[PDB]
Every structure is written in structure tokens, then in C-alpha cells.
Amino acid sequence: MKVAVLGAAGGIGQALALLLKTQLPSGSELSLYDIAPVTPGVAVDLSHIPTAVKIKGFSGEDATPALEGADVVLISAGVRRKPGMDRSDLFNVNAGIVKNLVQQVAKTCPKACIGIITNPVNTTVAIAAEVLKKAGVYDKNKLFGVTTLDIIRSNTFVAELKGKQPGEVEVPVIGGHSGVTILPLLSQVPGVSFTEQEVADLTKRIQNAGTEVVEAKAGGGSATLSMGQAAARFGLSLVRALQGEQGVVECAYVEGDGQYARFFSQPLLLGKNGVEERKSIGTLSAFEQNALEGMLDTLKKDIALGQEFVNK
Amino acid sequence: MKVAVLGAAGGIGQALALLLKTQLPSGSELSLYDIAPVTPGVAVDLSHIPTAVKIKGFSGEDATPALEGADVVLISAGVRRKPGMDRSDLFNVNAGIVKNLVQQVAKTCPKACIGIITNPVNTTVAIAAEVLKKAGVYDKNKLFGVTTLDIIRSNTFVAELKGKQPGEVEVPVIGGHSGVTILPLLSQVPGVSFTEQEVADLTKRIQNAGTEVVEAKAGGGSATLSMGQAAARFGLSLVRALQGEQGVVECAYVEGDGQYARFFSQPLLLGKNGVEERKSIGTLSAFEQNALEGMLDTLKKDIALGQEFVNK
Ligand SMILES: NC(=O)c1ccc[n+]([C@@H]2O[C@H](COP(=O)([O-])OP(=O)(O)OC[C@H]3O[C@@H](n4cnc5c(N)ncnc54)[C@H](O)[C@@H]3O)[C@@H](O)[C@H]2O)c1
Ligand SMILES: NC(=O)c1ccc[n+]([C@@H]2O[C@H](COP(=O)([O-])OP(=O)(O)OC[C@H]3O[C@@H](n4cnc5c(N)ncnc54)[C@H](O)[C@@H]3O)[C@@H](O)[C@H]2O)c1
């Protein structure tokens, strides 16, 4: 596999880089791209680690070199929010960045699996899809909004509440990636039960976890190291599936049948061509049904904002 | 085990943090300290990763909280060099930082195993030893200059030359950590042979690898991600030995019998009390014997500079 990381010099990009360098299968290639001029030196730094993964870094305005022959592209370029901001407040700086980078992907490697990490994900994934459509090159099985951080956050918060080993708990999370649209499916966590007070409290802690880190960093940024970890998990799942491994399933924000919104995050069976099947969200509790119904008008306004930017 | 990282908000500290969070044994504690006010937020970021390792971060002028009950302390605080500088040029900014932090270690956790990562290591380790002596608390089996990056750099450079799997080659490196005092023992690499031209060229590439990254980053710093990786390897070796694991051996810069200089890096058998035995450097080639003899006056000037700072 070749994996390209666009936005490699940032806080997220460097942590992701470190993890992919040390965890990608033997024989893999990793290319790093960022406009920042330190980027080739980030690749040299990493190239001193003894693993059988070839790494090169690229700088400047053209990402073509990084993108040639890429199977997976992971996009983490863009600005972080400051205390007192919402994710949607990032639209004005980041919409242009994502539009610019996906046109480059559309020209150079239109068959790659593309993971959008750039905030606000609910909207930027729709920007990506519209760009790829205009280029005559959209495949809805190969475009992903990366929501994996919500998953590993829920796993951590549940295990500590319920006295479980953190690596042993997996919770499904559906919806989107904003404070209102993150819905952890706590009724479906095997082997654990929660009171309704535990469900309310946990769901809030999970929805507000991004603002918790932003507040804690005090103007020094948002989640970088945990997000690096989450994105490396998703990327390695993509790579595993693309190499033919069976039964790899991840939740991600993806264009589907539209039963709830155009884009919606749900569990997905991954295969050699991207998403193999979009799995059922299953049976919801009364809390979960209610939370879902309540999020739906905010979700599709997020989507329409993205499509607007590209189509007007 | 409790492991404390002093200098946790820097480029090295954050990569080290990420790796220790994800790789330390279940039941471990990790505390992060830095004067930078973002540090508690670095710990919150990391605390969202689902592993059974407790993490807390501390800021301000007092490191006591981070240091209470620590078994291993890893010091990576200090300034990076810029293009055109030598490691020794960092003495004026970094000597004070190391003196300050080791006095805090001497008060709070005098029985911890201490790894000095701060440059220039040949000199700063001697600063550390003199501080701990003045505090009546020096144990020469528990003070380490961290040279592991020279090792993993050599492993990478050899494997690519000789068509080996990078994870399968281990090369002993003795001496110190400066351009003149890094001596890779290429005559002792099992299963590989080198021409004398290959030995000269490889030894140079290895000695100048730090300047290669500094040049490549263009004022954006020195090696951070690879150094994080190297320090995490050393820290996990320390932890393994302290928990009673057998036959863990690492090269590190350590006060020994003085046959070459006061401090000298050589292979060490690690045990429950720090270094268990200081191993023989073995039989040297004619190149290696010569390189060793030639480095010795520079090494002990490095040492005497450190002792001077503390003792005058
Ligand atoms: N939805 C999610 O779960 C999720 C996850 C991770 C990140 N994100 C978003 O990703 C972005 C990450 O920011 P960060 O924390 O790494 O901040 P950062 O400022 O540390 O990193 C951002 C990088 O983008 C680079 N950059 C800007 N435009 C570029 C372009 N055209 N091409 C390449 N590089 C360019 C910058 O030079 C920088 O290195 C934010 O929008 C964040 O909110 C969202
Ligand atoms: N000998 C080796 O192999 C080796 C290995 C790694 C690092 N080093 C040295 O370690 C230092 C690492 O720099 P970096 O690349 O991370 O640069 P950086 O600037 O990114 O990080 C340094 C950190 O030190 C912090 N700091 C300064 N004084 C502090 C103090 N009193 N206590 C706590 N925090 C404090 C800063 O706020 C910063 O976060 C340099 O001297 C480097 O040359 C040497």
C-alpha cells in the first residue's frame, strides 16, 4: 500500500505519521505533504526509525508528488478551534483548504480511499463529495468522514465507569461529529448495563469531550495525540481491508441510503473496494431513538452548507 | 511503575508521551511536567486513549507533584539547535535547566532511575551526577545518558545497505553522543560484513545524522519523532528490568570504571536496581581502536565542562 498524509506537519499529522511509520505492514510506503517548509525534514526524522516502511516528505503548493500511486489518502490539514468556538466556526478557514486538496486528489489518484479528518467533518465531507462529483470521479464507497475518535473516547469512558479493561470494550457511535450529532449507542455495549442516569451523563461527557480538551489546552490547540491514535486505527483498518482481510468493521461518516441524512455515520464492513456493506444501526433504546430524531435537522443543515460552498 | 516525563510539552516530550501511553504495561502511571501552560491539556488529550495507564499533567515552576513516587524519570526539557550549530553550543541555555530539574529529583525521588535526554548529553549527565552528589544522594547505577537514537539510526542505515530486515539488525554503539564521540561497533554486527570503505562511509553517516535532520528542518528544529521512539525504547527497557525481567541489555552513557573516561557509553545488563553489570566492549577492529583513541580528549573535556558548572 501507499498511504499519503496531507497536512503532515501539524499536531495531528506528526502523531499520525509517527504511528503509521511504526505500524504499517512491511513493504508499505508513506508520503507526507504540507505547505509548511519543515515537512521534508519531518520525513527525514521519521526515516531513521528501523521499520520496513519507505517514507518521503513534500512541501510547497503542489501535492501531486505525494499523491502519485496512493491507495489511501488521510487529510488532516486545517486550523484548530480556540476556547469559546464551535467546530462549525472553523468553516471559513477550512472549507477552501479541503476543496483545494480534494481537487488535487481527483486529478492524481481518483481511485484512492479518502479519509477526511479536517473540521467541521459533517460539512467538509460534503465539500469533498461535491468536488469529486464535479470531476466526474466520485465513488461513494471510498469517501470517509473520520469519526474514530468518538469511538475510542467512548471505550475509555465506559471502561472506567464500569471497571472494565479499556482495550476490551467497543462502543458503536452513530450520527456525525459535532456536539449535537455524536450518538454513542450505549444500549448495544456487550456485557455492560447502565442506569438511565449513567446513560445521560456518559452521552454528555462523550459529546463534549472535544471542548474538554480545547478548554484544557487554553489556546494551545485541540486534541492532537489522541486524534493521531484514532486516525491511525482507521487507516490501518482501511489498509487491512484493502489487502483482503475479512470482517474488518468500523463506524465512519459516509454517503449511504439517506434514511436519516445524505451522509451518516454507521457501522461499515470494509473490503477491497472501500465500504463493502453499510450495516444496520440495530435496535435503539428510547433515549437513543429520541436523541437521533432530535439531531436530524442540524445534521442536514451541516450537509447543505458543504454542498452550497461547492455548488454556488 | 510510575514514569515521570520532565519536558513533556516539547516535540520530543509529546511523541514520547504518546508512545509510553500506548505501550507501558497495564497498571502503569505516567505523569507529565513542563513549565509550558498547555501541559495539563496534553495529559487530558492522552487520557482519552483506551489503555490501562493513568496519566496526569502538571505545569508551573514546581515539579514535585509529577515526581512523587516516580520509579523512572525521563528528562527532555531544553532548547534545540539551529543549522550551523553544534550540540555543545547548547550548553549556555540548557545547563541551568538540567541543574534545576535534577535538584527537584534529588529532593523528591532520589531512588528513581534517571534518563537524561537533554543536549549536550556528554556534559549534562556530568551536571546531573554532581548535583546528585552535592545532595548526598548519587547512585551511579541509576543515572543514564540516553544514546538510544544512535543505536536505532545504525540499525536503519546497516539494514538498508546490506539488504537486511531493519528490525532484525542490532548494532552496538559506544563512546558518547556528539559528532566526534559516536562510535558504532560495525565489526560486531552478527551476520554482516563490511568493506573498509563501507565502514568509513557508514560511521560518518551515523555520526552526522543529527545534523542531517537539523539541516533538513531548516530552522524548524531537530529530531523529535525518531528521538521519541528511541527514548520510549530505552524507557520500556528500564521498566522491564525494574519489574524483574532477565537479560535486558542496552547501551547507555553511564559512570563506570573510568578506563576510558569518567562517563562512557557501553553495553549494560539492566536489573532491579538500575545497571546490573557494565559489559565488555569486546574486540575492536583497527578502525574502531583508532576512532576510540582519537575521541578520548574531546570526551573528557565535555565531562570536565559539566563538573565545572556545578562545582565553581
Ligand atoms: N472530525 C474529527 O474527528 C477531526 C479529527 C482530527 C482533526 N480534525 C480537524 O483537522 C484539523 C487539524 O488541526 P491540527 O490540530 O493538526 O492543527 P495544526 O495547526 O497543528 O495542523 C494543521 C496543518 O495544516 C497545514 N496546512 C494548512 N493548509 C494546508 C494545505 N493546503 N495543505 C497541507 N497542509 C496545510 C498547516 O501548515 C498545519 O501543519 C482541524 O480542522 C481539526 O479540527 C477533525
Ligand atoms: N542526547 C540525545 O540523544 C538527545 C535526545 C533527545 C533530546 N536531546 C535534547 O533534548 C532537548 C529537546 O528539545 P526538543 O526537540 O523537544 O525541543 P522543544 O523546544 O520542542 O522541547 C523542549 C521543552 O522544554 C521545555 N522546558 C524548558 N525548560 C523547562 C523546564 N525547566 N522544565 C520543563 N519544561 C521546560 C519547553 O517548554 C519545551 O516544551 C534538546 O536539548 C535536545 O538537543 C538530546
Coordinates of N, CA and C and ligand atoms in Angstrom, one line a residue, chain A residues 6-13 33-36 75-81 90 94 97 100-101 116-121 146-147 149 177 222-224 227, ligand 1:
Chain A
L6 N -1.9 14.3 3.9 CA -1.9 15.7 3.6 C -2.2 16.5 4.8
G7 N -1.3 17.4 5.2 CA -1.3 18.0 6.5 C -0.4 17.4 7.5
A8 N 0.7 16.9 7.0 CA 1.6 16.1 7.8 C 2.5 16.9 8.8
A9 N 2.6 18.2 8.7 CA 3.4 18.9 9.6 C 2.7 19.4 10.9
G10 N 1.4 19.4 10.9 CA 0.6 19.8 12.0 C 0.6 18.8 13.2
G11 N -0.1 19.2 14.3 CA -0.1 18.4 15.5 C -0.6 17.0 15.3
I12 N -1.8 16.9 14.6 CA -2.3 15.6 14.2 C -1.4 14.9 13.2
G13 N -1.0 15.6 12.2 CA -0.2 14.9 11.1 C 1.1 14.3 11.6
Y33 N 2.8 15.3 3.0 CA 2.7 16.5 2.3 C 2.2 17.6 3.3
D34 N 2.8 18.8 3.2 CA 2.2 20.0 3.9 C 2.8 21.2 3.2
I35 N 2.1 22.4 3.2 CA 2.6 23.6 2.7 C 3.8 24.1 3.5
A36 N 3.8 23.7 4.8 CA 4.9 24.1 5.7 C 6.3 23.5 5.3
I75 N -6.6 13.2 5.2 CA -6.5 14.6 5.2 C -6.7 15.3 6.5
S76 N -5.6 15.9 7.1 CA -5.7 16.5 8.4 C -5.2 17.9 8.4
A77 N -5.2 18.5 7.2 CA -4.8 19.9 7.1 C -6.0 20.9 7.6
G78 N -5.6 22.0 8.2 CA -6.6 23.0 8.6 C -6.4 23.6 10.0
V79 N -7.2 24.6 10.3 CA -7.0 25.3 11.6 C -7.7 24.6 12.7
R80 N -7.1 24.6 13.9 CA -7.8 24.2 15.2 C -8.7 25.3 15.8
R81 N -9.7 25.0 16.5 CA -10.5 26.0 17.2 C -9.9 26.4 18.5
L90 N -15.2 26.9 12.4 CA -14.0 26.7 11.5 C -14.3 26.6 10.0
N94 N -11.4 26.6 6.7 CA -11.0 25.2 6.4 C -11.7 24.7 5.1
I97 N -9.3 25.1 2.1 CA -8.3 24.0 2.2 C -8.7 22.7 1.6
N100 N -9.4 22.6 -2.1 CA -8.1 22.6 -2.8 C -7.5 21.3 -2.8
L101 N -7.3 20.6 -1.7 CA -6.7 19.3 -1.6 C -7.5 18.2 -2.3
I116 N -11.3 12.0 5.4 CA -11.4 13.4 5.8 C -11.4 13.6 7.3
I117 N -10.4 14.2 7.8 CA -10.2 14.4 9.2 C -10.5 15.9 9.5
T118 N -10.2 16.8 8.5 CA -10.5 18.2 8.7 C -11.9 18.6 9.2
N119 N -11.9 19.5 10.2 CA -13.1 20.0 10.8 C -13.7 21.2 10.0
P120 N -15.0 21.4 10.0 CA -16.1 20.5 10.6 C -16.4 19.4 9.7
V121 N -16.1 18.1 10.1 CA -16.3 16.9 9.3 C -17.7 16.8 8.7
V146 N -13.9 10.8 9.1 CA -13.2 10.0 10.2 C -13.8 10.4 11.6
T147 N -14.5 9.4 12.2 CA -15.1 9.7 13.4 C -14.6 8.8 14.5
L149 N -12.4 8.9 16.7 CA -12.0 9.5 18.0 C -13.2 9.4 19.0
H177 N -20.1 14.1 13.6 CA -19.1 14.5 14.6 C -19.2 16.0 14.9
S222 N -6.4 22.0 20.0 CA -7.3 20.9 20.4 C -6.6 19.6 20.4
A223 N -7.4 18.5 20.4 CA -6.9 17.1 20.5 C -6.0 16.8 19.4
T224 N -4.7 16.4 19.7 CA -3.8 16.0 18.6 C -3.2 14.6 18.7
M227 N -6.1 12.1 18.7 CA -6.7 12.1 17.3 C -5.7 11.4 16.3
Ligands
LIG1 N1 -13.5 15.3 12.8 C1 -12.6 14.9 13.5 O1 -12.7 14.0 14.3 C2 -11.2 15.5 13.3 C3 -10.2 14.8 13.7 C4 -8.9 15.4 13.6 C5 -8.8 16.7 13.0 N2 -9.9 17.4 12.6 C6 -9.5 18.8 12.1 O2 -8.3 18.7 11.4 C7 -7.6 20.0 11.5 C8 -6.4 19.7 12.4 O3 -5.7 20.7 13.0 P1 -4.4 20.3 14.0 O4 -4.8 20.1 15.4 O5 -3.4 19.3 13.4 O6 -3.8 21.8 13.8 P2 -2.3 22.2 13.4 O7 -2.5 23.7 13.2 O8 -1.4 21.7 14.4 O9 -2.2 21.4 12.0 C9 -2.8 21.7 10.7 C10 -1.8 21.6 9.5 O10 -2.5 22.1 8.3 C11 -1.4 22.6 7.5 N3 -1.9 23.2 6.2 C12 -2.8 24.2 6.1 N4 -3.3 24.2 4.8 C13 -2.6 23.2 4.2 C14 -2.8 22.7 3.0 N5 -3.4 23.3 2.0 N6 -2.2 21.5 2.7 C15 -1.3 21.0 3.6 N7 -1.0 21.5 4.7 C16 -1.7 22.6 5.1 C17 -0.7 23.5 8.4 O11 0.6 24.0 7.9 C18 -0.6 22.6 9.6 O12 0.7 21.9 9.6 C19 -8.7 20.9 12.2 O13 -9.7 21.4 11.4 C20 -9.3 19.9 13.2 O14 -10.4 20.5 13.9 C21 -11.1 16.8 12.8

